[PDB]
Amino acid sequence: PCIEVVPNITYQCMDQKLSKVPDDIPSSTKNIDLSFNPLKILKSYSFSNFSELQWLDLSRCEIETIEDKAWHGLHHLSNLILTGNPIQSFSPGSFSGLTSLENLVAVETKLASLESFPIGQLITLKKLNVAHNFIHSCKLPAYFSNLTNLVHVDLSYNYIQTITVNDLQFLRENPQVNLSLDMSLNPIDFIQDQAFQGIKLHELTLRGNFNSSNIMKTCLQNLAGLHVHRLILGEFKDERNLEIFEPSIMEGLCDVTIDEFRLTYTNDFSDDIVKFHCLANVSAMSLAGVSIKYLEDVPKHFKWQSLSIIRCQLKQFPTLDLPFLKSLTLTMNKGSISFKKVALPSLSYLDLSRNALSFSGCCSYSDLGTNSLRHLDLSFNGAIIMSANFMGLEELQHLDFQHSTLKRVTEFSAFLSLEKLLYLDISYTNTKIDFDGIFLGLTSLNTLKMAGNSFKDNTLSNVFANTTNLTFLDLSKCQLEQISWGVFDTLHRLQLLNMSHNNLLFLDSSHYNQLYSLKELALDTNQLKSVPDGIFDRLTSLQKIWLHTNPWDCSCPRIDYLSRWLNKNSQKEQGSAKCSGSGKPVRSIICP
Amino acid sequence: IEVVPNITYQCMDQKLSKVPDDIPSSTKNIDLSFNPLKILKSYSFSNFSELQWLDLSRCEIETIEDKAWHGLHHLSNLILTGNPIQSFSPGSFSGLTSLENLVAVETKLASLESFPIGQLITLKKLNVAHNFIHSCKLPAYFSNLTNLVHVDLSYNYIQTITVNDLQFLRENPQVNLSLDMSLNPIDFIQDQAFQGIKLHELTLRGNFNSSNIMKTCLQNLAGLHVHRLILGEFKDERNLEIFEPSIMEGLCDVTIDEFRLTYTNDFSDDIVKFHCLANVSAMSLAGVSIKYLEDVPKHFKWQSLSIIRCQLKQFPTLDLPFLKSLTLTMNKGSISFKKVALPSLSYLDLSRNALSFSGCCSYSDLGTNSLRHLDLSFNGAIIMSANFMGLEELQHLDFQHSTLKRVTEFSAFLSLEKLLYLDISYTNTKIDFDGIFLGLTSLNTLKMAGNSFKDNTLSNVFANTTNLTFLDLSKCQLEQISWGVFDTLHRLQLLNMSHNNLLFLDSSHYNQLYSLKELALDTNQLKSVPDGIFDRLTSLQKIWLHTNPWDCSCPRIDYLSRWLNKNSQKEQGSAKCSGSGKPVRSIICP
Amino acid sequence: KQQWFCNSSDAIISYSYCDHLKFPISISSEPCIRLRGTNGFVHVEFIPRGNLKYLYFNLFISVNSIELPKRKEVLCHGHDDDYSFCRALKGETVNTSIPFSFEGILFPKGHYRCVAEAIAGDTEEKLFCLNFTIIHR
Amino acid sequence: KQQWFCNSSDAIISYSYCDHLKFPISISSEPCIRLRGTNGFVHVEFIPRGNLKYLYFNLFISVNSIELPKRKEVLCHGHDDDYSFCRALKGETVNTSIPFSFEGILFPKGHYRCVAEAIAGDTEEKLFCLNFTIIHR
Numbered sequence A: 001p002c003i004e005v006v007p008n009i010t011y012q013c014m015d016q017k018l019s020k021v022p023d024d025i026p027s028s029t030k031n032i033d034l035s036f037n038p039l040k041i042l043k044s045y046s047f048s049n050f051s052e053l054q055w056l057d058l059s060r061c062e063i064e065t066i067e068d069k070a071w072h073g074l075h076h077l078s079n080l081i082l083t084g085n086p087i088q089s090f091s092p093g094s095f096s097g098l099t100s101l102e103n104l105v106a107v108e109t110k111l112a113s114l115e116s117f118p119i120g121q122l123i124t125l126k127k128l129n130v131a132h133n134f135i136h137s138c139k140l141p142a143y144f145s146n147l148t149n150l151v152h153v154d155l156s157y158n159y160i161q162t163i164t165v166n167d168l169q170f171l172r173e174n175p176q177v178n179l180s181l182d183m184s185l186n187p188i189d190f191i192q193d194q195a196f197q198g199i200k201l202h203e204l205t206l207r208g209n210f211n212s213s214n215i216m217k218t219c220l221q222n223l224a225g226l227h228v229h230r231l232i233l234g235e236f237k238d239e240r241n242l243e244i245f246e247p248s249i250m251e252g253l254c255d256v257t258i259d260e261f262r263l264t265y266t267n268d269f270s271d272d273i274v275k276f277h278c279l280a281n282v283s284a285m286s287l288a289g290v291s292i293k294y295l296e297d298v299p300k301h302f303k304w305q306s307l308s309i310i311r312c313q314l315k316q317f318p319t320l321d322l323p324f325l326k327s328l329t330l331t332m333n334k335g336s337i338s339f340k341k342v343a344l345p346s347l348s349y350l351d352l353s354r355n356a357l358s359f360s361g362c363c364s365y366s367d368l369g370t371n372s373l374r375h376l377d378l379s380f381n382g383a384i385i386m387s388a389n390f391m392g393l394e395e396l397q398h399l400d401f402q403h404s405t406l407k408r409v410t411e412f413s414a415f416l417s418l419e420k421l422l423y424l425d426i427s428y429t430n431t432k433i434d435f436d437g438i439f440l441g442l443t444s445l446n447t448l449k450m451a452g453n454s455f456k457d458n459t460l461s462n463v464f465a466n467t468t469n470l471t472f473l474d475l476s477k478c479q480l481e482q483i484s485w486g487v488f489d490t491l492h493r494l495q496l497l498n499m500s501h502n503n504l505l506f507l508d509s510s511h512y513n514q515l516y517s518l519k520e521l522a523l524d525t526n527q528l529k530s531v532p533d534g535i536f537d538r539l540t541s542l543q544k545i546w547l548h549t550n551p552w553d554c555s556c557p558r559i560d561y562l563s564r565w566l567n568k569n570s571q572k573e574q575g576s577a578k579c580s581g582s583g584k585p586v587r588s589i590i591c592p
Numbered sequence B: 001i002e003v004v005p006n007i008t009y010q011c012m013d014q015k016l017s018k019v020p021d022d023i024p025s026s027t028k029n030i031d032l033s034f035n036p037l038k039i040l041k042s043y044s045f046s047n048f049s050e051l052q053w054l055d056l057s058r059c060e061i062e063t064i065e066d067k068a069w070h071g072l073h074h075l076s077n078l079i080l081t082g083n084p085i086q087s088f089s090p091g092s093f094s095g096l097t098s099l100e101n102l103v104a105v106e107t108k109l110a111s112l113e114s115f116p117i118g119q120l121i122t123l124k125k126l127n128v129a130h131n132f133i134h135s136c137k138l139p140a141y142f143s144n145l146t147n148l149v150h151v152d153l154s155y156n157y158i159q160t161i162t163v164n165d166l167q168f169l170r171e172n173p174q175v176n177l178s179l180d181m182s183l184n185p186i187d188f189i190q191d192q193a194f195q196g197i198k199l200h201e202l203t204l205r206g207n208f209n210s211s212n213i214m215k216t217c218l219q220n221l222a223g224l225h226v227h228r229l230i231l232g233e234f235k236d237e238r239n240l241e242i243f244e245p246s247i248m249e250g251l252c253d254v255t256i257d258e259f260r261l262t263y264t265n266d267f268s269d270d271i272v273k274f275h276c277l278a279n280v281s282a283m284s285l286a287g288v289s290i291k292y293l294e295d296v297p298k299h300f301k302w303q304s305l306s307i308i309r310c311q312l313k314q315f316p317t318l319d320l321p322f323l324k325s326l327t328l329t330m331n332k333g334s335i336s337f338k339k340v341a342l343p344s345l346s347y348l349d350l351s352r353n354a355l356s357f358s359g360c361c362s363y364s365d366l367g368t369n370s371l372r373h374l375d376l377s378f379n380g381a382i383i384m385s386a387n388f389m390g391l392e393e394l395q396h397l398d399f400q401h402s403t404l405k406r407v408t409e410f411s412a413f414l415s416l417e418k419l420l421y422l423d424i425s426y427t428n429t430k431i432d433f434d435g436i437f438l439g440l441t442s443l444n445t446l447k448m449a450g451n452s453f454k455d456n457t458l459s460n461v462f463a464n465t466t467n468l469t470f471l472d473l474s475k476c477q478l479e480q481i482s483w484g485v486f487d488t489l490h491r492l493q494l495l496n497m498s499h500n501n502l503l504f505l506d507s508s509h510y511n512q513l514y515s516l517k518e519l520a521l522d523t524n525q526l527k528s529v530p531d532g533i534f535d536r537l538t539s540l541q542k543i544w545l546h547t548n549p550w551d552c553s554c555p556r557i558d559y560l561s562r563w564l565n566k567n568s569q570k571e572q573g574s575a576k577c578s579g580s581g582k583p584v585r586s587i588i589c590p
Numbered sequence C, D: 001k002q003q004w005f006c007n008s009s010d011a012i013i014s015y016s017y018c019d020h021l022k023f024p025i026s027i028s029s030e031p032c033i034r035l036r037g038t039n040g041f042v043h044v045e046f047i048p049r050g051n052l053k054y055l056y057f058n059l060f061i062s063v064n065s066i067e068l069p070k071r072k073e074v075l076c077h078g079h080d081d082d083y084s085f086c087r088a089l090k091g092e093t094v095n096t097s098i099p100f101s102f103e104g105i106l107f108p109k110g111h112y113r114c115v116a117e118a119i120a121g122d123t124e125e126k127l128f129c130l131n132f133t134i135i136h137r
């Protein structure tokens, strides 16, 4: 029984209609997955001779009783997953011997409270998950004093309706305790005054708690005092959403102290919420799944240092003059918006990917208003028209255009001023390289990804002549039929060359003479019938080579160098080169 | 230099003393331009009688001596431009029995009054631009020339227009005439001078130095009826500093079917919303720095609007409920499409704007059910998301060179049952889905060059596209063709599969193509052909097989060398043998 | 082996389990889907064989034998997602019902298939696989 | 050969006629072009060997011997054109100063060549052809 995953190491007994734990398992096993077996009960010393288990998963095991002493041989076990088990009685120290336990997951374990929960010995704990249970107390037992390393707790989907100054009575005792709390999906109506006074919370998640405005409004006023790092706030498309939602509802956040705010989906939304006055002193404003439609007039004093808009619904591209902003991220937009000028002189990181965004007259200082941009991701978008070669942006190390429709890139040296650029991806941009100076300027370039494109006369021309420090080059799917002389003569630091998925008919030994530091060469799935003798002999750093899916002609004496060569080097060949007609491997063939 | 055998000759810049005797007596066009001549001799070419078109531009001529134009009994076009032949005595226009078009540009001429073209009743077009004329005055001999419909008065010294100048037109409201006043420094038009006059089109471009002067001059067009009026200026000329819309008032005393604005150094979006334009039937901007065009008043009686080479920053909003035709083309920007509501709209042209367009296309985009022509060529990303619910009257759809997205993800032309013509060439569409053209059952003309197919296999997409007479699959990287692919296309008259990478043909595709006239297969990678392949190509008129590496081994090249030799009149270009170079026509298997 | 059906102004939806993945789940619309346009709810009841943190779908649709290319559809992106069920862990109870709303495209008439493999992004392990059948008028 | 020349704060421009097309023109700029940026006039006096109704240009540019793809620039589209001279006819004297204006993109330094065939898209013949030489510093 059981599956074979990483033998004597990870196994999968999931859903093996098992009576109980099988001994027919290597003792060295470090990963078991018994979930979905009618075990019903955990007869003790069950996990005794599986002595170096790390990851135990007993989800949906129908278990009613932990006959304690069950976890004895497991000094080093970290993950224990008991989800969906009808355990009523967690009889004290039931978690016996689990000395190295970091992560405890007792979701839907029919649990009434932490009071009745025998976990005070497990100092090693960090994560505790008691979501989906029968809990009503926000309060944290006094034995957390003992659990030094506990850093996060998850009470979402319980029955907590109320938060008192006592529920929290404990964080006050140790305001040098880093804890994070998730209370999403708890039908909360009451937090009392001063409940959240002098409290130290890292991540507090309040999602889908409130049934209507007034409850939230008021519950929120009564967080006052709290210093929090990350407050996550919103509701859910599949639950009861506040029919109405006005910014007023976050009065008193102005008493709550936040560095990262994070708004999620909400039935009713108001563009005025992100302008809302109580968020001015966040250092990481952030939106997700939100139906915000415009984003203009964000007051200039605001101290947002990163902003991030994700899966939202902008109709038009933000107007932003925020001078303290270091990272903008607008991504997966519903729209097809079109880029508009900005002025964020503090900006260093711009990810505008996946918006079907359209960008006319890219790219220079004028467009952005910083001289310290290092990362421009314009990938998965629409028509990017290159009318400007990055004058002003010369601090850049990451340019991604992949899968967008770049236009005019071959009409001048469009990347001329990008002398510090380390990574360029123009793969899949429907670009046809008509011009050999396409890449002038890019003297620092390491990674060049330019698959899925094409070349004048299907010829790989001399476009790399001074992209000398190139270490990764992808020319896969570029319809190449051949390669002009000289092209690679300078790429001495090149390590990976991919020229697979092309239509090459021959190769020429005049290319590989100087790829001194090259370790990887894909030439698979072209149309080579053959290779010149000795072609690979000067590739002194070589490790892997792909050559399959070419119709190699195995007539001797022709196929001799290569057969011999691959046989000697079989270790390096990835996949398997084969003969036209016969279908036999190439390393197999022996000439007289 | 004869270009057409014995029927047109080009003698331009030949340092020629005078006309050559040498040249044939049949020649129908002749060009002696840029030759020193100085005198158009008497009877100078009596022999060249079967002559339609004569051009003597910049021939350095100073004298038309008497009866130079004999015989010339059929000459329609005559071009004397740039010759200093200053004085034309009642002895220069002899016997142009059939002259339609006379061109005296830069001939130093100073007046029409004394200009000797009196009984050339045939005349359709006179052009006297770039001369010394100081007077608008339209001679009375014009009564004798009832054929004349167009006079070019451009680049002359005219400052004034006076009621007697245009008297002739008052006493001839049956005459249909057109005037080009452009590049004259007109500062005064006398009151009532355009009362009871009709012009077909009048061109007033680059006339005015000063805002006020234009305003007053335009004032005194009052009462004019003009089919097409053309206004504005040029960039290589002294422009108007200010151009306030009010400078147009008193166009509402003139009557205009078609108004046409051109470049204007200074321009105001609200100039095209002027009230004195509301009754124009065809509004048209061209070369203008218009940036918005939004709140156009619904009473405006515009039936056609053409914006060309302008600078819109945003796609116009429009509710003009009698607009039948909208052309927005060559826009400076990239702009993105916004919905409109044009219920009279039947012809939309939005080509060449780098236009992007989320959620193409359906009724709610446009607000018409009568759209017969949609042209979205040469634009940006067009995101196909509806399939033309509401637009089912479409007969012509053009997507050429735009980047068409999602078109392979559903049947996106499903509702276009009336569609005759589809261009999806160079849209870089990679055809994944055989139902892509479902719905297009009326379709004749399918252009889809420069795309590609999954597995480079032409698959079965023409199953129900059955009235195709014209299919272009050139440049689609094809390597092979699925089996039944062409079996439905009983009406097909042209099939292009050139510039592809086919290595073999299968004969089953091409039998049954009985209706086919043209078949291009050149510039593939073919070496051979199934014996028989072309036999039932009964209607065939033209075949291209060249630029393929044909193997002229015998007995292999037998069928074809024979066939192509027998059908040598239909072969376009020449199918040559690999190695040698020898036409396949000419091989003879033993 | 149907596990459901429903009729409507145009559509006759229905689904069985996939021959190769029978893992249980139960699921229903409200109303029955009109392809012309529809607002409603999707009732889903089942207990997953893996975490739904990165839930997504693979749809293998086909009209009258014409395969559409594999369509992918993400539900849980694994960050601040819009659905409660995204937090579901392996072998947890899931009852929710999900609102949906759409105006129709003109779909060709006839016999549609669609297998919907659900998949857990974190592991690419298939969670389940339905096999719908839609007939349209 | 040198028909004209001028040098500016970053460029040194000059032209000749094209080896196999000598038809005359005298053209110049005021000011001399600075590649970094320039407002000025192109003065042009010549006699068209053709109608200018569809005047356009083919620019065969080449930076330090690297050829750019042929570039095409229409001046007269033959319809409501922006310039006086599109109206000019073969033979007619032409004299004009054409305003122009630009902001420099970054140009690599060195030796440019630009041959500029002028063409009359009515007959498609050649009007004239200059061979420029820009030397950027």
Ligand SMILES: CCCCCCCCCCC[C@@H](O)CC(=O)N[C@H]1[C@@H](OP(=O)(O)O)O[C@H](CO)[C@@H](O)[C@@H]1OC(=O)C[C@H](O)CCCCCCCCCCC
Binding pocket: B359, B384, B385, B386, B406, B409, B410, B411, C013, C033, C035, C061, C063, C068, C101, C102, C103, C104, C105, C107, C108, C114, C116, C132, C134
């Ligand atoms: C021939 C093969 C067809 C295969 C069909 C599947 C693929 C169809 C893809 C076309 C639709 C898609 O590209 C665009 C879309 O999604 N549009 C919705 C969007 O419309 P916009 O106008 O773009 O705002 O948002 C609008 C507002 O929300 C909304 O009105 C639009 O909704 C649509 O048009 C979606 C379609 O109508 C699809 C309907 C899905 C039917 C569900 C069947 C379920 C059967 C059971 C299987 C699990």
Ligand SMILES: CCCCCCCCCCC[C@@H](O)CC(=O)N[C@H]1[C@@H](OP(=O)(O)O)O[C@H](CO)[C@@H](O)[C@@H]1OC(=O)C[C@H](O)CCCCCCCCCCC
Binding pocket: A361, A386, A387, A388, A408, A411, A412, A413, A437, D013, D033, D035, D061, D063, D068, D101, D102, D103, D104, D105, D107, D108, D114, D116, D132, D134
């Ligand atoms: C390796 C390089 C060799 C190739 C060089 C030639 C090709 C260069 C093409 C790049 C620019 C072009 O794609 C876009 C353009 O046209 N920009 C003008 C436009 O700018 P926006 O981006 O729209 O604001 O509109 C602006 C407002 O009018 C205007 O300022 C912008 O100006 C430019 O970008 C033009 C460039 O600076 C090019 C300058 C031409 C220099 C003239 C040479 C003189 C000698 C002539 C010899 C024939």
Ligand SMILES: *[C@@H]1O[C@H](CO)[C@@H](O[C@@H]2O[C@H](CO)[C@@H](O)[C@H](O)[C@H]2NC(C)=O)[C@H](O)[C@H]1NC(C)=O
Binding pocket: A151, A178, A179, A202, A203
């Ligand atoms: C408090 O707790 C968290 C969680 O242990 C600490 O870790 C950072 O935050 C996230 C949790 O959301 C971790 O997963 C990251 O690895 C940590 N940050 C980064 C950038 O990796 C957090 O540092 C703790 N706070 C303090 C002051 O110790």
Ligand SMILES: *[C@@H]1O[C@H](CO)[C@@H](O[C@@H]2O[C@H](CO)[C@@H](O)[C@H](O)[C@H]2NC(C)=O)[C@H](O)[C@H]1NC(C)=O
Binding pocket: B449, B474, B475, B496, B497, B498, B499, B518, B520
């Ligand atoms: C068939 O297709 C080709 C390629 O699209 C047509 O165009 C020929 O090749 C180039 C590329 O388009 C054009 O510039 C030429 O003008 C065309 N050839 C010639 C000889 O002029 C070709 O015309 C098409 N032929 C038919 C009959 O439709």
Ligand SMILES: *[C@@H]1O[C@H](CO)[C@@H](O[C@H]2O[C@H](CO)[C@@H](O)[C@H](O)[C@H]2NC(C)=O)[C@H](O)[C@H]1NC(C)=O
Binding pocket: A451, A476, A477, A498, A499, A500, A501, A520, A522
């Ligand atoms: C070289 O390029 C090929 C093609 O891009 C790479 O293969 C990858 O992309 C394929 C596209 O056909 C996909 O099938 C795969 O996701 C992936 N290949 C595999 C086996 O998974 C290939 O990774 C590249 N080779 C390298 C980097 O050595």
Ligand SMILES: *[C@@H]1O[C@H](CO)[C@@H](O[C@H]2O[C@H](CO)[C@@H](O)[C@H](O)[C@H]2NC(C)=O)[C@H](O)[C@H]1NC(C)=O
Binding pocket: B149, B176, B177, B200, B201, B227
């Ligand atoms: C007046 O004469 C003009 C010039 O011949 C006629 O021609 C114009 O109008 C026609 C259609 O109405 C066009 O087909 C012609 O090409 C067009 N020519 C020009 C230069 O515009 C015109 O028809 C006559 N007037 C009317 C009202 O019909």
Ligand SMILES: *[C@@H]1O[C@H](CO)[C@@H](O[C@H]2O[C@H](CO)[C@@H](O)[C@H](O)[C@H]2NC(C)=O)[C@H](O)[C@H]1NC(C)=O
Binding pocket: C018, C019, C020, C115, C131
């Ligand atoms: C999904 O359901 C269809 C319908 O039962 C399965 O295909 C079967 O039905 C075909 C016509 O619809 C029959 O002709 C076939 O015999 C039968 N399929 C096979 C392989 O025999 C389909 O296989 C089901 N889903 C899967 C495989 O995921």
Ligand SMILES: *[C@H]1O[C@H](CO)[C@@H](O[C@@H]2O[C@H](CO)[C@@H](O)[C@H](O)[C@H]2NC(C)=O)[C@H](O)[C@H]1NC(C)=O
Binding pocket: D016, D018, D019, D020, D115, D131, D133
């Ligand atoms: C314009 O002039 C340049 C030189 O300034 C020409 O360049 C010469 O090209 C020909 C090729 O036949 C050679 O004779 C010379 O060696 C070249 N000289 C240099 C310095 O490169 C160019 O050919 C001219 N324009 C044309 C031919 O249109």
Ligand SMILES: *[C@H]1O[C@H](CO)[C@@H](O[C@H]2O[C@H](CO)[C@@H](O)[C@H](O)[C@H]2NC(C)=O)[C@H](O)[C@H]1NC(C)=O
Binding pocket: A254, A277, A278, A279, A280, A281
């Ligand atoms: C934002 O939080 C800051 C954090 O200290 C608060 O104080 C700042 O903003 C005040 C608004 O006028 C200024 O008076 C102070 O200069 C500044 N004070 C400090 C100590 O930094 C402020 O209460 C919060 N602002 C809002 C609008 O809620």
Ligand SMILES: *[C@@H]1O[C@H](CO)[C@@H](O)[C@H](O)[C@H]1NC(C)=O
Binding pocket: B252, B253, B275, B276, B277, B278, B279
């Ligand atoms: C436009 O037409 C209406 C109705 O004929 C009329 O009241 C008005 O004078 C006209 N305006 C003009 C021609 O400017």
Ligand SMILES: *[C@@H]1O[C@H](CO)[C@@H](O)[C@H](O)[C@H]1NC(C)=O
Binding pocket: B438, B439, B463, B464, C064, C108, C109, C110
């Ligand atoms: C096209 O004809 C076939 C065979 O008659 C049919 O099955 C197919 O579905 C038709 N096209 C449609 C419905 O769009």
Ligand SMILES: *[C@@H]1O[C@H](CO)[C@@H](O)[C@H](O)[C@H]1NC(C)=O
Binding pocket: C095, C096
């Ligand atoms: C799921 O929700 C509906 C709402 O009434 C209910 O009928 C169904 O039985 C619910 N829950 C369970 C556990 O069955």
Ligand SMILES: *[C@@H]1O[C@H](CO)[C@@H](O)[C@H](O)[C@H]1NC(C)=O
Binding pocket: D045, D095, D096
């Ligand atoms: C052409 O125009 C310039 C501009 O002032 C002038 O100096 C020059 O002499 C003119 N040439 C002729 C022949 O008029």
Ligand SMILES: *[C@H]1O[C@H](CO)[C@@H](O)[C@H](O)[C@H]1NC(C)=O
Binding pocket: A465, A466, D108
């Ligand atoms: C690459 O070109 C640069 C800049 O044009 C030039 O200096 C050099 O000749 C080339 N690189 C090298 C290493 O020679």
